[PDB]
Amino acid sequence: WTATSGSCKGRCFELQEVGPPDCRCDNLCKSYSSCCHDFDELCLKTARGWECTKDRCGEVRNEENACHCSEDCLSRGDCCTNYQVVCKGESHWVDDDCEEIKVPECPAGFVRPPLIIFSVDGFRASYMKKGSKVMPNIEKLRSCGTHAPYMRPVYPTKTFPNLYTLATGLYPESHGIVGNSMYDPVFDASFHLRGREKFNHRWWGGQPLWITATKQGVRAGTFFWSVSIPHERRILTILQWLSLPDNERPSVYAFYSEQPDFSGHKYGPFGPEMTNPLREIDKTVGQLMDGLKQLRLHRCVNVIFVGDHGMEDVTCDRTEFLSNYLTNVDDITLVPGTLGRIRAKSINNSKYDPKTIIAALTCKKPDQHFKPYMKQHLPKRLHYANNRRIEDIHLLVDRRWHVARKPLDVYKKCFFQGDHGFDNKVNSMQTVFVGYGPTFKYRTKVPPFENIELYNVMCDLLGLKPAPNNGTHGSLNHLLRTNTFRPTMPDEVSRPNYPGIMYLQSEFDLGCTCDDKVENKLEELNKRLHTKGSTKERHLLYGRPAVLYRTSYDILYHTDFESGYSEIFLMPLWTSYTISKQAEVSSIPEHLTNCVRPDVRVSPGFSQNCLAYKNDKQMSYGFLFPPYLSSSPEAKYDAFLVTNMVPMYPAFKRVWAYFQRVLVKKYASERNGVNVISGPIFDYNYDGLRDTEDEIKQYVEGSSIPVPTHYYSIITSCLDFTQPADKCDGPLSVSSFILPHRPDNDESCNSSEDESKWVEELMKMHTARVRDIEHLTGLDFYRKTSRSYSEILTLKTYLHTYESE
Ligand SMILES: *[C@@H]1O[C@H](CO)[C@@H](O[C@@H]2O[C@H](CO)[C@@H](O[C@@H]3O[C@H](CO[C@H]4O[C@H](CO)[C@@H](O)[C@H](O[C@H]5O[C@H](CO)[C@@H](O)[C@H](O)[C@@H]5O[C@H]5O[C@H](CO)[C@@H](O)[C@H](O)[C@@H]5O)[C@@H]4O)[C@@H](O)[C@H](O[C@H]4O[C@H](CO)[C@@H](O)[C@H](O)[C@@H]4O[C@H]4O[C@H](CO)[C@@H](O)[C@H](O)[C@@H]4O)[C@@H]3O)[C@H](O)[C@H]2NC(C)=O)[C@H](O)[C@H]1NC(C)=O
Ligand SMILES: Cc1cc(OCc2ccncn2)c(C(C)(C)C)cc1Cl
Ligand SMILES: [Ca+2]
Ligand SMILES: [Ca+2]
Ligand SMILES: [Cl-]
Ligand code: NA
Ligand code: NA
Ligand SMILES: [Zn+2]
């Protein structure tokens, strides 16, 4: 109940929400059915429209008008945005040359430059180039300020997950808004785009920017705009708040536009009908900038022009139907569209089985346009698993397609020609970023980055300390003229041991054998030096990774590779090696096929054993430094050490062997040498974070050898590929992956074929940031380079996407 018979007199778009059943006058009252009786009349004026004309100049103030052209309007803060232009001979902001804003030029009483976030729904990255002719204000912001060619949204590439990620710096799995539709089994409650439940605060986790600001003494304008409030009024309201007295005036504001998304759904991303919505958005930007210029704020305010996701061509005929795969279609609930989420229709039905649902959806048709996953097997770069609102069964839908349960769902619901929601690496889903103002750089292009990074920057822009989030603070310092955040490297927590030769061969009873008894002062001093770390500067190019948790581990040096060997997990945490352009690939000699050698630097009690692999009929083993890339027949023996061995399903060895035998050398050829760091990852609770030992759910049968859920590699070279990886003077280039360690290759539908037809495609799908691997391992890489730390942070957030231009 609301007693809607109070009044909005003097209260229009009040910043503090009043408690029911007192009537509300805030920009949210419309959404709650709670506005005072006179809200429309007082707060949503429209008389005479939105622009001054010649005949209105210096008019007598009429309080009925939408905006004003009277002499007193500047001091009242309520002129039409074009008042100075029409009535005072001023130029529009877009017609002024751009001039570097070296320092904030703010009216007296402003303690800090305000921030205005101008967010646009469905604004695909390529609109910046393709619509440039019809967006002169946006193009001026873009060319004069700081911009990226595109900004990567989060998955799923839907509106609320992305806007709330912008507000919090969190992955959807952590902020809780994991889709546009949700069921929370703990609450036993559902969240929908339509309706009231979406306004309940228990859906919205983390700490959004307006709360961060308020808690730290910075006032905030409202972020949510009720749909029926026209754009012109949103702008005028922001401008009015900006004329408040110093103690009442917010420092952070948001505008939101439902366009171009709204039209994009109806006409497709490049429909001829799309030109008009882009013109209209640009005109709105023009109104804001003219309005700031009138208030002498146009060289004071930082403006961020940012999208939530792009838009792809998607029509009704490109719909796959679960009814063409499943007999039990009525025993399942599907969240449909550009992604699929499946759960049982009834928790009372114990005959429901996810295993057989997945199998029935796996590689069943030759051109199948979706791929089923258990959520923990989704590419780790999506960070889409650790939330009870994300169903165990997930369908990754191909770009341009939909998934639906039954045909009737689609024609009893062609309407649409566009949609979004797909994998956040897809080009059509990419969106925009422009920063313009005293705190941003002048005429600067920056590399593409992920929207999870912006919360930290918005906090820096406002002098706020960010709540804990998934950004990497400092990685976007290169966007900023000032207010940078000067992070330090995390402290190493565990220092390594450097074991020498401490064990005789006969002390080991591991059930391993090797044909290696084949017997020189020249080359005995030589081998000693290699074991003491003489080639270490060649194979460990950026310093050893720091171990950021408490553990027991040994550094092991070898001619061709260096490793950090965990006495707790019985295998390396990391193995580092450099492969120059000239390096030669060789084979595993016949007499060494099953060779595994005790490492006399490491106790039997802290070693793996061969008997466990023999006894474990599902589990085989592989090596982290590949024997194929040994520098000499003699160095090859090092690669067969029990300390270089890791557990691998035979199905996974097909992947790994092709990566090590073919792909590493290909990359070294193309990139002029690579440095490779590889290792295991344990993430049994799919939280994106390193497992402790007591979280490991699987061991090699009969042993304490833990089975990794994934294997990583980080592959680094010189960005200037005229320089070899091991002699690089400037910026680095990186690509990484986190491959799932799976006992089958069901994910790859062409796996019966030669590895050359499917392996590299799988690795591309599981591309990762170095930062993703840092979370998963508790390691910190690139500790010793000649580069600035902020530059290294940017490198650690890089994602190699393998999309075209
Ligand atoms: C991305 O960035 C984010 C932010 O930094 C990272 O997420 C953090 O990770 C931490 C580790 O997982 C986690 O710390 C835990 O916090 C527990 C208290 O949490 C509450 O309070 C915070 C602070 O205000 C709040 O933010 C939390 O909000 C979550 O939950 C509510 C609903 O409950 C949601 O609305 C909200 O969206 C959010 O949900 C998300 O997080 C939870 C986990 O907290 C997930 O379950 C959800 O799926 C969702 O993703 C909370 O309200 C604290 O209790 C934990 O402490 C336990 O574990 C420690 C280990 O040190 C142990 O020492 C303690 O004893 C304790 O164990 C006891 O409880 C166990 C579990 O019940 C039990 O088994 C034991 O036996 C003990 O009894 C823990 O410290 C932190 O909360 C989240 N923060 C957020 C915002 O998500 C994230 O990791 C980053 N991602 C990547 C890839 O890097
Ligand atoms: C810039 C911005 C705008 C936002 O909301 C704008 C909006 C969206 C849908 N309907 C009405 N208004 C949000 C919400 C989290 C969604 C509050 C966050 C940000 Cl960062
Ligand atoms: Ca949207
Ligand atoms: Ca984990
Ligand atoms: Cl969804
Ligand atoms: Na075996
Ligand atoms: Na397969
Ligand atoms: Zn949309």
mmCIF file of C-alpha atoms in Angstrom, residues 641-748:
data_model
loop_
_atom_site.group_PDB
_atom_site.id
_atom_site.type_symbol
_atom_site.label_atom_id
_atom_site.label_comp_id
_atom_site.label_asym_id
_atom_site.label_seq_id
_atom_site.Cartn_x
_atom_site.Cartn_y
_atom_site.Cartn_z
ATOM 1 C CA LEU A 641 62.585 -37.676 -14.281
ATOM 2 C CA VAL A 642 59.777 -38.705 -11.979
ATOM 3 C CA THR A 643 59.701 -35.047 -10.924
ATOM 4 C CA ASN A 644 58.615 -33.940 -14.444
ATOM 5 C CA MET A 645 55.696 -36.513 -14.583
ATOM 6 C CA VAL A 646 52.005 -35.571 -14.158
ATOM 7 C CA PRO A 647 48.804 -37.630 -14.273
ATOM 8 C CA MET A 648 46.967 -37.719 -17.595
ATOM 9 C CA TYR A 649 43.967 -39.554 -18.978
ATOM 10 C CA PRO A 650 44.841 -41.238 -22.300
ATOM 11 C CA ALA A 651 42.193 -39.118 -24.009
ATOM 12 C CA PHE A 652 43.923 -35.967 -22.698
ATOM 13 C CA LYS A 653 47.375 -37.246 -23.726
ATOM 14 C CA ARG A 654 46.227 -37.009 -27.346
ATOM 15 C CA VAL A 655 45.707 -33.239 -26.809
ATOM 16 C CA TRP A 656 48.871 -32.684 -24.744
ATOM 17 C CA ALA A 657 51.148 -34.687 -27.045
ATOM 18 C CA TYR A 658 50.021 -32.704 -30.084
ATOM 19 C CA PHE A 659 50.518 -29.408 -28.226
ATOM 20 C CA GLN A 660 54.062 -30.418 -27.146
ATOM 21 C CA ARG A 661 55.247 -32.198 -30.343
ATOM 22 C CA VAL A 662 53.725 -29.887 -33.021
ATOM 23 C CA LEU A 663 52.312 -26.694 -31.589
ATOM 24 C CA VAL A 664 55.142 -25.429 -29.373
ATOM 25 C CA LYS A 665 57.592 -25.562 -32.282
ATOM 26 C CA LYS A 666 55.008 -23.885 -34.574
ATOM 27 C CA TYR A 667 54.627 -21.032 -32.131
ATOM 28 C CA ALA A 668 58.394 -20.669 -31.719
ATOM 29 C CA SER A 669 58.696 -20.487 -35.512
ATOM 30 C CA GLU A 670 55.925 -17.864 -35.905
ATOM 31 C CA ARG A 671 56.836 -15.799 -32.818
ATOM 32 C CA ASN A 672 60.643 -15.966 -33.012
ATOM 33 C CA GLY A 673 61.133 -18.142 -29.962
ATOM 34 C CA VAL A 674 58.725 -18.695 -27.075
ATOM 35 C CA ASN A 675 59.109 -19.092 -23.376
ATOM 36 C CA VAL A 676 56.596 -21.636 -22.041
ATOM 37 C CA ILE A 677 55.404 -22.033 -18.450
ATOM 38 C CA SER A 678 53.172 -25.106 -17.950
ATOM 39 C CA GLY A 679 51.571 -26.752 -14.941
ATOM 40 C CA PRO A 680 48.598 -28.434 -13.302
ATOM 41 C CA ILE A 681 45.482 -26.675 -11.933
ATOM 42 C CA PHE A 682 43.192 -28.075 -9.182
ATOM 43 C CA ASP A 683 39.715 -26.523 -9.072
ATOM 44 C CA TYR A 684 37.374 -29.255 -7.875
ATOM 45 C CA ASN A 685 34.842 -26.748 -6.411
ATOM 46 C CA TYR A 686 34.837 -24.668 -9.665
ATOM 47 C CA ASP A 687 35.321 -21.370 -7.810
ATOM 48 C CA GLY A 688 38.145 -20.171 -10.124
ATOM 49 C CA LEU A 689 40.555 -20.353 -7.198
ATOM 50 C CA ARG A 690 43.406 -22.697 -6.222
ATOM 51 C CA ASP A 691 42.236 -25.795 -4.240
ATOM 52 C CA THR A 692 43.809 -26.638 -0.898
ATOM 53 C CA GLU A 693 44.835 -30.359 -0.587
ATOM 54 C CA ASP A 694 41.697 -31.203 1.359
ATOM 55 C CA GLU A 695 39.508 -30.155 -1.601
ATOM 56 C CA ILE A 696 40.946 -32.725 -4.052
ATOM 57 C CA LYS A 697 38.234 -35.181 -5.108
ATOM 58 C CA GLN A 698 40.340 -37.605 -7.184
ATOM 59 C CA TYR A 699 43.743 -39.337 -6.793
ATOM 60 C CA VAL A 700 45.659 -41.825 -8.931
ATOM 61 C CA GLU A 701 44.297 -45.148 -7.624
ATOM 62 C CA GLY A 702 45.992 -46.263 -4.438
ATOM 63 C CA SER A 703 48.248 -43.224 -4.012
ATOM 64 C CA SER A 704 48.321 -39.679 -2.760
ATOM 65 C CA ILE A 705 48.984 -38.367 -6.301
ATOM 66 C CA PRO A 706 46.178 -35.793 -6.865
ATOM 67 C CA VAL A 707 44.558 -35.550 -10.320
ATOM 68 C CA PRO A 708 44.487 -32.063 -11.842
ATOM 69 C CA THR A 709 41.134 -30.741 -13.213
ATOM 70 C CA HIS A 710 43.132 -28.677 -15.762
ATOM 71 C CA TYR A 711 46.547 -28.060 -17.352
ATOM 72 C CA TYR A 712 47.779 -24.531 -18.173
ATOM 73 C CA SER A 713 50.431 -23.073 -20.408
ATOM 74 C CA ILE A 714 51.599 -19.456 -20.595
ATOM 75 C CA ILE A 715 53.461 -18.717 -23.816
ATOM 76 C CA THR A 716 55.499 -15.503 -23.922
ATOM 77 C CA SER A 717 57.577 -13.873 -26.645
ATOM 78 C CA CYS A 718 58.767 -10.379 -27.721
ATOM 79 C CA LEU A 719 56.019 -8.073 -28.976
ATOM 80 C CA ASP A 720 58.657 -6.937 -31.519
ATOM 81 C CA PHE A 721 59.056 -10.317 -33.166
ATOM 82 C CA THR A 722 62.243 -9.192 -34.958
ATOM 83 C CA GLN A 723 63.786 -9.822 -31.535
ATOM 84 C CA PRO A 724 64.110 -13.418 -30.263
ATOM 85 C CA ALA A 725 62.101 -14.318 -27.147
ATOM 86 C CA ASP A 726 65.285 -14.737 -25.061
ATOM 87 C CA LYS A 727 66.753 -11.338 -26.082
ATOM 88 C CA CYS A 728 63.772 -8.982 -25.939
ATOM 89 C CA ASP A 729 64.337 -5.322 -25.096
ATOM 90 C CA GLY A 730 60.778 -4.007 -24.884
ATOM 91 C CA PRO A 731 57.116 -5.034 -24.440
ATOM 92 C CA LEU A 732 56.087 -8.709 -24.278
ATOM 93 C CA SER A 733 53.459 -10.695 -26.161
ATOM 94 C CA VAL A 734 51.500 -13.495 -24.435
ATOM 95 C CA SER A 735 48.952 -16.187 -25.082
ATOM 96 C CA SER A 736 47.732 -18.737 -22.512
ATOM 97 C CA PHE A 737 45.272 -21.552 -22.098
ATOM 98 C CA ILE A 738 43.663 -23.635 -19.344
ATOM 99 C CA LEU A 739 42.766 -27.004 -20.911
ATOM 100 C CA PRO A 740 40.249 -29.183 -19.066
ATOM 101 C CA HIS A 741 41.792 -32.477 -17.998
ATOM 102 C CA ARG A 742 39.024 -34.802 -19.227
ATOM 103 C CA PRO A 743 38.934 -38.620 -19.638
ATOM 104 C CA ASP A 744 37.131 -38.281 -22.960
ATOM 105 C CA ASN A 745 37.153 -35.914 -25.892
ATOM 106 C CA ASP A 746 33.334 -35.628 -26.094
ATOM 107 C CA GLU A 747 33.654 -31.840 -26.237
ATOM 108 C CA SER A 748 35.405 -32.085 -29.638
#
